[PDB]
């Protein structure tokens, strides 16, 4: 994928001015180096490959860290996490995508389990990760029948097993994931992307049965966007994100701080 090259230019003395235009039009004015300056002639190699959509979002990033705290005692009762699925939680990522009003793509989810040991030993730990679709029965105990995962997609990970990871086909029931949403509920409520981008929820639970060593599971979740398209680019996020599925941004008793650096005087940068 190449960039045009630069052509020798010459001492114009034309009745035709290309430099003079009007932005009113709403158009970006078409003027190139040569147009305005006796230029050289340059063979350009420069490549936009990397500047490709897939090249951008086609990189794995973190979207969620789901910490589970092992409690020996009531073992079969707690010791399970839940996460309402979405990307709106981890700026880095969020912002990029929030670059466009719609996006379509499959997702490669990659996992990173971390065992923070608490007793002088770890023992043998086994995790389960059931992706639970909206409508599917939500587990309510480290032993909910739900972890029979008879139709659901569940993936298992143990101490020593290499990072798990899988692939997921663009979901949603419309052509694209909505990045933003100027609309409400069937009940005029919840003005938010939140209306749609319920994807279901992710759930983990240690399989290893009642044992000895108190410990902590810190499974981090990572996501690469595959086979990508997007439309209607929007200006980037300017400040910190407050909450998910909301554009909100005004913060408890603190300045509206952009990114713009201020200066003394315009006649000096």
């Amino acid at each position: 994928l190449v960039v045009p090259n630069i052509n020798s230019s010459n001492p114009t003395t034309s009745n035709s001015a290309p430099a003079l235009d009007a932005a009113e039009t709403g158009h970006t004015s078409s003027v190139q180096p040569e147009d305005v300056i006796e230029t050289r002639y340059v063979q350009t190699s420069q490549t936009r490959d990397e500047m490709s959509l897939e090249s951008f979002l086609g990189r794995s990033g973190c979207i969620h860290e789901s910490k589970l705290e092992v409690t020996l005692a009531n073992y079969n009762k707690e010791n399970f996490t839940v996460w309402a699925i979405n990307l709106q939680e981890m700026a880095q990522i969020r912002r990029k995508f929030e670059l466009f009003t719609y996006t379509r793509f499959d997702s490669e989810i990659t996992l990173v389990p971390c065992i923070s040991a608490l007793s002088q030993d770890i023992g043998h730990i086994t995790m389960q990760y059931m992706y639970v679709p909206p409508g599917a029965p939500v587990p309510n105990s480290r032993d909910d029948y739900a972890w029979q995962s008879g139709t659901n997609a569940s993936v298992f990970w143990q101490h020593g097993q290499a990072y798990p990871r899988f692939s997921l086909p663009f979901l949603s029931v419309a052509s694209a994931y909505y990045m933003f949403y100027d609309g409400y509920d069937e009940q005029d409520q919840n003005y938010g992307t939140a209306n749609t981008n319920n994807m279901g929820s992710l759930c983990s639970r240690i399989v290893t049965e009642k044992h000895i060593h108190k410990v902590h599971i810190m499974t981090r979740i990572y996501h690469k966007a595959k086979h990508v398209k997007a439309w209607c680019p929007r200006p980037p996020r300017a400040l910190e994100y407050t909450r998910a599925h909301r554009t909100n941004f005004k913060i408890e008793d603190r300045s509206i701080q952009t990114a713009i650096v201020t200066r003394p005087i315009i006649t000096t940068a």
Partner: peptide, 25 residues
């Protein structure tokens, strides 16, 4: 099935559309 970028082989070992690697342009 092998090609030229910015020669190597690459068929899809996987049966599902999403399973497949990063697209081309």
């Amino acid at each position: 099935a092998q090609v030229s970028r910015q020669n190597y082989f690459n068929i899809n070992y996987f049966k599902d559309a999403a399973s497949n690697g990063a697209s081309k342009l």
